RNA sequence: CUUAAUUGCGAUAACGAACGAGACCUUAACCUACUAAAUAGUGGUGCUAGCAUUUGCUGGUUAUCCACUUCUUAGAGGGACUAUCGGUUUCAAGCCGAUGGAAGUUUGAGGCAAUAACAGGUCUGUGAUGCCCUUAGACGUUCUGGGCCGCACGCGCGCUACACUGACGGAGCCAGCGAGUCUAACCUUGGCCGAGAGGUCUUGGUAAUCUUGUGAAACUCCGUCGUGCUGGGGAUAGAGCAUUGUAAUUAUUGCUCUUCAACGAGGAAUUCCUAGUAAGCGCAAGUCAUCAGCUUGCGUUGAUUACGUCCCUGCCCUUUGUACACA
């Protein structure tokens, strides 16, 4: 089992069904120079190192 | 109630075999090993606690961790 | 969220144009500045006032003041 | 260096004194501990039987000295619990008096505490001796 | 007359007036140490100044502490506060700058209101509650 | 320790491990590694708190609540459910003893149990309700440090209260078998259990 | 009897005294006035005494048999 | 401090508001050793529509 | 501080004062899952026969437990004013008497039957299975009797 | 585009003004400054002691006195301004972080809170009373008591334990909003006896003073029990000691003693709520003869979770339809 953990970098604006969600653009520190672009849960800020369980993924605004 | 109620000297005899090497080993800890009830449990942990046996770091109402006699 | 209302806003810019060869960019100074040049009845108000001005000056030597 | 009074091991020091009271033989009693709870409110009786008499009698003198006069009316509010009547809400309900008054009535016959004038019951220059004498006991426990 | 730097400290709604003057260095509160003032776990955490620091400044001072009203918990920090900001204020009355300085420099490096102060207390109940907002089960019908 | 001898009689003892190192109640709070990625800030244990209780006001603040202690976290989560869904004074002394079976169970720094009891307890993705087609069917997502240590405390307090619920099992027992059995995945407390199929959802839905 | 003392002085300026006009207006309609004639002589009345605010609700049925709310208010009437 | 505090509107139907028309006394003192002239001018001059003073002669 | 374990002569549900007595608990509170022996009225049989509030039942002798039938049945007798009774002032002539065990069920349903018999709302209604101490039940009563 | 807000900037076929809002009134915060205060309190000192008996540790005489104004009191004043800097936006209103500070969500926060609509509520506080009925055989009223207090079935308003973060014992023994008699019985202490209650013997208070430091519960200390319709709840019922009151039953409550109800975590559902907030809890009161489980608040102890969006509800607003105006 492969796990990531990418370090936020920048906000795209917050979404969520009733509001409790966020587009994230991240950047694992393994290999940096990649960001890969997801979805966030609860407080975010840039440079929070993530737990996501994926390497290629992404998914657009959550309604 | 079922199992561990009364005193009948047999049980002080198996526990005092559950006190010594005992890393946790405190009054109603020994409760659940089947073997004696809380309530006598406490006069017995407090006549072996006075041995050295078991190490008190606790002393309040129901919760009173022991360590063992090292 | 702090945003002063219209009231005190209109006052204090007419200020500037009848006080500019004076007018201090600190508030602590500049609040009993507005205590002898106007008349006002508000304590709380009193003190939006002074401090809008110390605001606005401070950037208004920002070069273009087209306000 | 010294000691005072209010220096002194909290719980530990009101069973040790109210074991004196049994003890000196100075206690005098017409005989009522244990048919009551020393309240209107208490529903359960002690784990410990012998006492909670002499008990009760020991933590009086204690706020008497540390302060100036008390009786039994502020003993009654100072003693006073909520009483569950059921799912009907509590109370503080004064508790009872019979036993507070010939408590220290009968330390009074001896020479424990005193009268005092005007209201409330003051402590005597015996009284002082004996309550900082049992202060030393617990004290020769601790430093 | 005798030297102290009267002080005080409470919260919510307590009492509580602590003095710093010139003597034998001690915590007696109508005469018993801060070190028997209970609930047990709160009486290592009104000891807590004292550890940063050391009770070695403590060593030549009287602390006269007293505390009534309020509550008993409300009084845990209110006989703190009464004592932090009256050493405090014996090291601008019998003390250098300095020394002080480093001092409090101590104490918002790890906050915990020994000096400033708490602005915490009781809303206005309304007219459908016990708390504030607080507003009855409104079931509509 | 510089001997200090005064009026009143200060046990040299309590001195000694706070007049030198205010750590708790007797418990080694330095030191400590970061076994995981961040918590960092999120995760407190740099402010050596020697009690269980502090002037709290990080509430007031949406990322002051995470520089707020880790350990202030639990017996925030513990001082809950009906009878004591306040008072703090309760779970504070019970929480000792808790951290106490610990101590004498691997020793170690007791902060450093539950460092690890927030690293691999922490859910990495909880499921949210989404929409796609037919019905709305939940889906989860990436989370981020500070809810992995917030939503830990809170199922780390659920199975410790149905563990000390209709179970003769003391408070301090139950609390130091929601700690120990949080070494690094038991699958035993209630809390890995909703996180282990946020997991499940987390991979047949990524 | 002796130590009471009944007094009288004049009103001030009934005009911008909104509770001495109430008075006379009181017996004003109940003297035989009207409706839009006799609510607008009053309020003009404390026009010449140079107020700032007159507010006078009229709440009651106009020959149309519905007592509805008619504003005979002007000037500078702010409610805080 | 009086505080009257009663049903907002008089009749008994409505929602969930309550009133509390306050008011309260205000109390301050003079303690004073002078004689019968200057005292006995305080009760009878400087008075103002609805004002009383509470004045005890001698200290028993 | 003593351990107390003593011999084993401990014998499950035994037999006392006309009643089905239960074990397996303290001697003190033992007693008081019975109709009749009350909490605090059984409290007294134990202190006043010298039983302690730290022993439990299992043992002691058959000696001590027969004073203390004769102690709860007849309080004229053994030191039990009235106010311990749930029927002092008695009912004839100035005495007292209170219901132990197998006399409460009697003495119950037995003084009921002759305050019906002189035709009185207390016993009359309690027979129409209804409410006899005065109070509403205008609301509530979903489940009766 | 921002704000609790038409707060307002900004933008412009509009210009500049009026009300609501804000401001303001109101409370508590920070007030080692002021009037100073023993009707609040702190300390030293004449005078008596406990324990030091070699620094002192601590009560006492609302005149033994002097001193402060810190604790407390409360009028006059003072203060705070996103103000200090950097990022972000047209280099806008602003936003945000860090700051010290008493305080950066009006500071928290209440009272006011435009015009209008209702055929909202009250003819039952209204001696406001239109229209109406009634007056010797009264719909005004009075006497006895019920009915207002009579319940297969029920919504809704709180509560309760169900246990062990719990049941009980003494013990550590902390409040604020309080609130109290004239030709009289309202706060009633100190008290002797007493199961609670009370009989009986009295003074003090007409009020920061006397009552009474609300000596409350909460919670802590070391113990008793041990998940059992059990000692969990004291049901339910009955003889009994007394207060109010002409009189207590269908009884008003305190409480002594006996017995011991569904309930094993609450059905589809669904309320309050973003910090001294939720919730736990009592006091005096409003109530008021006794009786309140209701409500004012207030002190008291004191969480968790987002800081976003319009998903479900309540409302607002243009693009737009109209064949609707009792909408």
Same mark, same amino acid.
């Given at each position: ?63 | ?70 | ?67 | ?143 | ?141 | ?206 | ?80 | ?60 | ?46 202190? %006043?026969?010298?039983?302690? #509030? ?10 001590? !437990? /027969? @004073?203390?039938?004769? *102690? ?22 100035? %005495?007292?008497?209170?219901? #132990? ?10 003084? !009921? /039957? @002759?305050?019906?018999? *002189? ?27």
């Amino acid at each position: 089992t492969p796990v990531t953990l990418a370090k936020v970098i920048k906000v795209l604006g917050r979404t969520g069904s009733r509001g409790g969600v966020t587009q994230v653009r991240v950047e694992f520190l393994e290999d940096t120079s990649r960001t890969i672009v997801r979805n966030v849960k609860g407080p975010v800020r840039e440079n929070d190192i993530l737990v996501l369980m994926e390497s290629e993924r992404e998914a657009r605004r959550l309604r | 109630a079922q199992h561990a109620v009364i005193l009948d000297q047999e049980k002080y005899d198996r526990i005092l075999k559950e006190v010594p090497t005992y890393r946790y080993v405190s009054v109603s800890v020994l409760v659940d090993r089947l073997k004696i009830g809380g309530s006598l449990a406490r006069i017995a942990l407090r006549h072996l606690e006075k041995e050295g046996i078991i190490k008190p770091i606790s002393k309040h109402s129901k919760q009173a961790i022991y360590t063992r006699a090292t | 969220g702090r945003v002063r209302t219209k009231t005190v806003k209109r006052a204090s810019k007419a200020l500037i144009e009848r006080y500019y060869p004076k007018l201090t960019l600190d508030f602590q100074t500049n609040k009993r500045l507005c205590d002898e040049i106007a008349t006002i009845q508000s304590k709380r108000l009193r003190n939006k006032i002074a401090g809008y001005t110390t605001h606005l000056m401070k950037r208004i030597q920002k070069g273009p003041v087209r306000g | 260096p010294g000691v005072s009074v209010r220096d002194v091991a909290a719980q530990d020091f009101i069973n040790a004194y109210a074991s004196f009271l049994q003890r000196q033989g100075k206690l005098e009693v017409p005989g009522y501990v244990d048919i009551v709870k020393t309240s209107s409110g208490n529903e359960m009786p002690p784990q410990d039987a012998e006492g909670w008499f002499y008990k009760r009698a020991a933590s009086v003198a204690r706020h008497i000295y540390m302060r100036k006069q008390v009786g039994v009316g502020k003993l009654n509010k100072l003693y006073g619990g909520a009483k569950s009547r059921g799912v009907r809400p509590y109370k503080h309900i004064d508790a009872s008096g019979s036993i507070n008054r010939k408590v220290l009535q009968a330390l009074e016959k001896i020479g424990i505490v005193e009268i005092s004038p005007k209201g409330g019951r003051r402590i005597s220059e015996n009284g002082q001796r004996d309550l900082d004498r049992i202060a030393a006991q617990t004290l020769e426990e601790d430093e | 007359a005798v030297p102290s730097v009267q002080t005080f400290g409470k919260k919510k709604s307590a009492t509580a007036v602590a003095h710093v003057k010139a003597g034998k260095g001690l915590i007696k509160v109508n005469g018993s140490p801060i070190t028997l003032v209970e609930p047990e776990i709160l009486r290592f955490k009104v000891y807590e100044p004292l550890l940063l620091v050391g009770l070695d400044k403590f060593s030549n001072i009287d602390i006269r502490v007293r505390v009534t009203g309020g509550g008993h918990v409300s009084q845990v920090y209110a006989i703190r506060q009464a004592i932090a900001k009256g050493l405090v204020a014996y090291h601008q009355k019998y003390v250098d700058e300095q020394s002080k300085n480093e001092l409090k420099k101590a104490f918002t490096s790890y906050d915990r209101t020994l000096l400033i102060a708490d602005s915490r207390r009781p809303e206005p109940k309304k007219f459908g509650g016990k708390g504030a907002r607080s507003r009855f089960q409104k079931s509509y019908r | 320790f510089t001997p200090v001898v005064l009026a009143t009689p200060i046990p040299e003892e309590v001195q000694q491990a706070q007049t030198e190192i205010k750590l708790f109640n007797k418990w080694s709070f330095e030191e400590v590694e970061v076994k995981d990625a961040s918590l960092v800030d999120y995760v407190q244990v740099r402010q050596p708190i020697f009690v269980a209780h502090t002037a709290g006001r990080y509430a007031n603040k949406r990322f002051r609540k995470a520089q707020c202690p880790i350990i202030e976290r639990l017996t925030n989560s513990l001082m809950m459910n009906g009878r004591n869904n306040g008072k703090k004074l309760k779970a504070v002394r019970i929480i000792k003893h808790t951290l106490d079976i610990i101590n004498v169970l691997t020793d170690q720094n007791p902060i450093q149990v539950v460092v690890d009891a927030i690293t691999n307890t922490g859910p990495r993705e909880d499921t949210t309700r989404v929409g796609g087609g037919g019905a709305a069917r939940r889906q989860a997502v990436d989370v981020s440090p500070l809810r992995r240590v917030n939503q830990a405390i809170a199922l780390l307090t659920i199975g410790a209260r149905e563990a000390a619920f209709r179970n003769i099992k003391t408070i301090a027992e139950t609390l130091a078998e929601e700690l120990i059995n949080a070494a690094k995945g038991s699958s035993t407390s209630y809390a890995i259990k909703k996180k282990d199929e946020l997991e499940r959802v987390a991979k047949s839905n990524r | 009897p002796g130590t009471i003392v009944l007094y009288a002085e004049r009103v001030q300026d009934r005009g911008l005294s909104a509770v001495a006009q109430a008075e006379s207006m009181k017996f004003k309609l109940l003297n035989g006035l009207a409706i839009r004639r006799a609510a607008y002589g009053v309020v003009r009345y404390v026009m010449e005494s140079g107020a700032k605010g007159c507010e006078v609700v009229v709440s009651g049925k106009l020959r149309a048999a519905r007592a509805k709310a008619m504003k005979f208010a002007d000037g500078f009437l702010i409610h805080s | 401090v009086l505080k009257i505090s009663t049903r907002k509107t008089p009749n008994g139907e409505g929602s969930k508001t309550w009133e509390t028309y306050e008011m309260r006394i205000h109390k301050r003192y003079i303690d004073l050793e002078a004689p019968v002239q200057i005292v006995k001018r305080i009760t009878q001059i400087t008075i103002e529509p609805g004002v009383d003073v509470e004045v005890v002669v001698a200290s028993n | 501080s003593l351990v107390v374990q003593e011999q084993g002569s401990f014998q499950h549900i035994l037999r006392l004062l006309n009643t089905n007595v239960d074990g397996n608990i303290k001697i003190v509170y033992a007693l008081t899952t019975i109709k009749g022996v009350g909490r605090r009225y059984s409290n007294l049989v134990c202190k %006043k026969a010298d039983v302690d #509030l730290h022993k439990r039942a299992g043992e002691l002798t058959q000696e001590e !437990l /027969e @004073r203390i039938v004769q *102690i709860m049945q007849n309080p004229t007798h053994y030191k039990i004013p009235a106010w311990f009774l749930n029927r002092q002032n008695d009912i004839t002539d100035g %005495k007292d008497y209170h219901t #132990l065990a197998n006399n409460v069920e009697s003495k119950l349903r037995d003084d !009921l /039957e @002759r305050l019906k018999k *002189i035709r009185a709302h207390r016993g009359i209604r309690h027979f129409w299975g209804l409410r006899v101490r005065g109070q509403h039940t205008k609301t509530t009563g979903r489940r009766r009797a």
